[PDB]
Amino acid sequence: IPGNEKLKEKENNDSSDKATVIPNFNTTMQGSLLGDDSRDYYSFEVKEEGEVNIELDKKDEFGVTWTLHPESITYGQVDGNKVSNKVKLRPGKYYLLVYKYSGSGNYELRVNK
Amino acid sequence: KLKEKENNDSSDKATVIPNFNTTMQGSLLGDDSRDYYSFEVKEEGEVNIELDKKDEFGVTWTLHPESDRITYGQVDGNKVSNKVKLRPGKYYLLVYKYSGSGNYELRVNK
Numbered sequence: 061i062p063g064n065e066k067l068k069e070k071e072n073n074d075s076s077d078k079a080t081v082i083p084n085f086n087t088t089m090q091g092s093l094l095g096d097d098s099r100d101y102y103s104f105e106v107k108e109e110g111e112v113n114i115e116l117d118k119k120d121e122f123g124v125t126w127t128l129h130p131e132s133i134t135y136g137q138v139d140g141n142k143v144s145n146k147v148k149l150r151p152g153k154y155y156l157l158v159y160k161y162s163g164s165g166n167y168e169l170r171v172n173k
Numbered sequence: 174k175l176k177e178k179e180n181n182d183s184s185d186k187a188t189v190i191p192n193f194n195t196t197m198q199g200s201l202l203g204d205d206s207r208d209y210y211s212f213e214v215k216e217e218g219e220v221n222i223e224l225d226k227k228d229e230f231g232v233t234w235t236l237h238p239e240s241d242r243i244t245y246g247q248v249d250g251n252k253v254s255n256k257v258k259l260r261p262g263k264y265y266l267l268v269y270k271y272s273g274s275g276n277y278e279l280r281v282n283k
């Protein structure tokens with residue numbers, strides 16, 4: 061995708077206060093949940109109301125999903141190596157928690173309009 | 174008056190819920206953000222998982238079998254609930270927070 065930037069997560073990001081910012085809607089966040097690292101929190105700012113697509117792509121076979129809520133609840137839908145949803149979001153800050161329920165592995169996270 | 178047993182942050186360390194219709198007390202304070210539990214169904218039926226928040230914070234749960242079947246708690250104010258038909262087997266129930274800190278009670282009703 062033209063201009064898509066790959067950006068690494070920034071640990072410690074295990075709570076909402078410590079969330080890694082997704083600075084725009086054309087970034088691919090790269091993260092890992094190995095061993096005792098079982099939660100990676102992200103945030104993003106919606107500036108224009110509209111449908112946002114959230115897609116987590118597993119790079120390894122493990123049990124991982126996500127939960128979104130506004131600062132002011134949407135769950136990832138697990139389908140094999142993709143965990144996705146589409147949701148109409150109003151302007152404001154959102155908190156996107158990627159967390160595992162089994163195993164260990166790496167993932168990429170794409171939040172798009 | 175049964176209580177969770179830390180550390181229970183992963184499924185291999187899950188706190189056993191010994192019986193249905195039995196209240197478990199837990200907390201997710203500060204950097205304790207995950208409490209894993211397990212339970213065993215012996216007869217197929219509808220199970221009603223109910224988490225009661227004792228403080229206002231963002232907490233929910235995720236159920237999966239020991240064997241992509243996954244079920245999420247539905248947040249409604251201070252209750253996080255669902256009803257799911259389960260076949261005999263072992264299940265893992267992850268109670269986790271997404272904001273704040275607080276105490277809760279958990280039941281697997283049947």
Ligand SMILES: [Ca+2]
Nearest residue numbers: 092093097100
């Ligand atoms: Ca990580």
Ligand SMILES: [Ca+2]
Nearest residue numbers: 073074099100
């Ligand atoms: Ca992390």
Ligand SMILES: [Ca+2]
Nearest residue numbers: 200201205208
């Ligand atoms: Ca606990």
Ligand SMILES: [Ca+2]
Nearest residue numbers: 181182207208
């Ligand atoms: Ca715990």
Ligand SMILES: [Cl-]
Nearest residue numbers: 213214215216
């Ligand atoms: Cl039973």
